Design a protein around this ligand. Structure first.
Ligand SMILES: [Zn+2]
Ligand SMILES: [Zn+2]
Ligand SMILES: [Zn+2]
Lengths: 339, 339, 339
């Protein structure tokens, strides 16, 4: 909701409240857990007309969790998701710096359209696949105006040496190219980065360099949404050995994402998706599957502000999973207000 | 303050800044402590007209403390208080899920009108008496329109198995009935819930089931506010043995709340209240009083935005208190801006 | 950006997003560190016309850091900076209580005009030099209207006995006098406060009383900003022995701040500043320099919303520094959106 629009400066303050609950059995071995998952979000998107050819913009977004008590754990789960400012200039393109999605997410976010879950490979603080701190991203749209619907981007990932091996990264560079023609859109993205010595000093994952590339195809027209993603990572997908409490990254993963959705004119939006990410040559185990499930979901939009949804995950992970990944199903039911 | 009101969607962004200070002697043994208690709050209340008979709504509220440093403890005290969305439909009633007050608070919040203190029995994360996470609440007003001023509600309290015994709960169900006629209002509420094994594995409090019921009467007309509350709990009121640092819940409490206030036409709003909650059959001690005080207070409202207040607690707890509950008085002085 | 302005009540909701990066070598021994420093801020300033002569006001401000992950450390760096409400009455003056700047900052904030750094002596939770919790401040402007441009203030600093020795303080009183005539402004400020027993039970810093006074001169006209500050502290400047991990305060400091800036009409705003704070009679070491650097910086303002800057610190601290204070330079590059 727009709050100020004078001097060619618009500031849209937005947010939402999501009453959410996950249902599972026992949910220690659940895919997505069990219990109250209510949360809220707040943010703003500002845009200012510097001149005829230049425009400045800033974006912030925060996630306040609502499933926590008012005592010791009240702060659990709260996170800054977006924090970046930049300039959009003429037909040259755009540059921004701060916390933002990696360029691999340009192609990876194609199948991240599921009501509650989906995009399991878009980890936060995982180089290029998800939201990361300190990324300079140059994005050019319509290739300088000469070639319509043909966009690309290049990103410089800065060294983020956090105390955690999982949330750390080194210096990197990535890019993506997309092409959106008559309903369709096909994307390729790639990124490489140095690994921190803490990352390298881990039992799982061997290498002095991380790689993430992903390709995507989507159809978005005539009330149909259909997407497909394929990605491979090298020492860049976080894993955890449940049996030995061992962290680290998978030496290699092959990731497949599918989504098919039709939005009814009266509100109901059923969803069919599939997700399978299998690791290869993990230390002590070899090949394992990180995620494998079929999703059946539906969202009912009353209007643009209010909606409810159900998201059913039919977990195809087996109870023989060597990494101790959960094998049980998870059903998510939510009611969402947003502005 | 309303920020957007188009397409039959209103979003009221509100908040306040409260400069607050508690005065006490020594305040280790104070009732309410001693020192700076400044805090701020932010929230929004959105409401959308889905159709002629249906309306969606979301509410979020947060408490940013202002008495903390900018260093290590900057996050202390911050909490999400409200986070819930729901639908109000026609004369059927309303349903919402998220973090919200329990149904016992329907009758308990009658005497929670004191400037700074009061409602000492409305503990957060305490089943039905205060704000709790993951509550589905169906509330019906004017009994389907047939019987005016006669409202009731039913709530399903979901399992919240936090790491803390104090902030945890099991599966529960509660309800309330109220009747508001010509200035008056009388309420009865009740709720029961399973206790977690962590709760059950506590020195203080014995039982595999928690109970909380409360009745209330208020008069709110002719610039007079007068309220009375009586409540009983079973294994559902948090206690702490100061001498042995022992947590747990009181096996039984009998809780009495009284409030009398008159709002002068020119701003001053004196307050007279009384609070006594005594525990029974506590392990190792037996009967003890959790709170016992007389309150003398006054708030001066300049207008609807600005106000100051003084709240004096005349603590009737004695220095022989077996649980080590404080016996000293506490004076609260505050200055409040809100929008 | 103003969001509501009815019934003589204006509420300005403001904030910013700052993409920021510090560059250094190795930055363990850097002056300002090394890596992503992106952050965002949110706040509101409300003002209500109580009557013809009286006005109420509240101010809140928060700093959400953007350089943190979405995991364990997501909350790191977040702090409430402002939280205070008060009354401005006629020509008598103003009173407010809450978290706010100390009165020494009245004169100290003269040289705190640098793009990213500067005002190194305005520590938070350090009595009167920076932002502190629980301060009652009476400020009078134009000396009751009789003497134009002649302002003064008196502040009562309340006991803040935090668990940290660094973030604690005792009872204190401070004041300031300023005089702003035809572009110029000259200020004197002083404050004294009791030290906590925790503060007194520290290896570094000896005394049962803290002192902070500072004088200032600024010229702010004809697109020129030039400021000079001198301050002395007694047991009131936080120090840390890097070699022995020893905290405490400097027995005495002499602090010098200089700033010279010219704002070009087309946007560029170069900056020249100097900062030197040397400690005296520190336990085990004697005299040391806390900070010593020359700054060369420039900010380019596109408009009132958007800007970028570079801030170069030429660190004059030497690698023989007895306290282990960093000797390397630090370059800060930032891009800022605000509303
Ligand atoms: Zn963004
Ligand atoms: Zn609510
Ligand atoms: Zn302020």
């Amino acid at each position: 909701a727009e709050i100020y629009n004078k001097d060619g400066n618009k500031v849209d303050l937005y947010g939402k409240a999501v009453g959410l609950h996950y249902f599972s059995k026992g949910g220690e071995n659940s895919y997505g857990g069990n219990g109250d998952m209510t949360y809220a979000r707040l943010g703003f998107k500002g845009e200012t007309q510097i001149n005829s050819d230049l425009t400045g913009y800033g974006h912030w977004e925060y996630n306040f969790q609502g499933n926590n008590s008012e005592g010791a754990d009240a702060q659990t789960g709260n996170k800054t998701r977006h924090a970046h400012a930049g300039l959009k200039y003429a037909d040259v393109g755009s540059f921004d710096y701060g916390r933002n999605y990696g360029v691999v997410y340009d192609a990876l976010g194609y199948t991240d359209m599921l009501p509650e879950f989906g995009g399991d490979t878009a980890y936060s603080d995982d180089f290029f696949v998800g939201r990361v701190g300190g990324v300079a991203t140059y994005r050019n749209s319509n290739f300088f105006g000469l070639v319509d619907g043909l966009n690309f981007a290049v990103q410089y990932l800065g060294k983020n040496e956090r105390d955690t091996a999982r949330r750390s990264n080194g210096d990197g560079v990535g890019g993506s190219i997309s092409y959106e023609y008559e309903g369709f859109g096909i994307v390729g993205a790639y990124g490489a980065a140095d690994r921190t010595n803490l990352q390298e000093a881990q039992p799982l994952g061997n290498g002095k360099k991380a790689e993430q590339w992903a390709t995507g195809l989507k159809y978005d027209a005539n009330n149909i949404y259909l997407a497909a993603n394929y990605g491979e990572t090298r020492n860049a997908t976080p894993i955890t050995n449940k049996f030995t409490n061992t962290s680290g990254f998978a030496n290699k993963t092959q990731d497949v994402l599918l989504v098919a959705q039709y939005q009814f004119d009266f509100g109901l939006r059923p969803s069919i998706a599939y997700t399978k990410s299998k690791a290869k040559d993990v230390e002590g185990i070899g090949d394992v599957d990180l995620v494998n499930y079929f999703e059946v979901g539906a969202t009912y939009y009353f209007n643009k502000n209010m909606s409810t949804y159900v998201d059913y995950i039919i977990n195809q992970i087996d109870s023989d999973n060597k990494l101790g990944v959960g094998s049980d199903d998870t059903v998510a039911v939510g009611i969402v207000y947003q502005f």
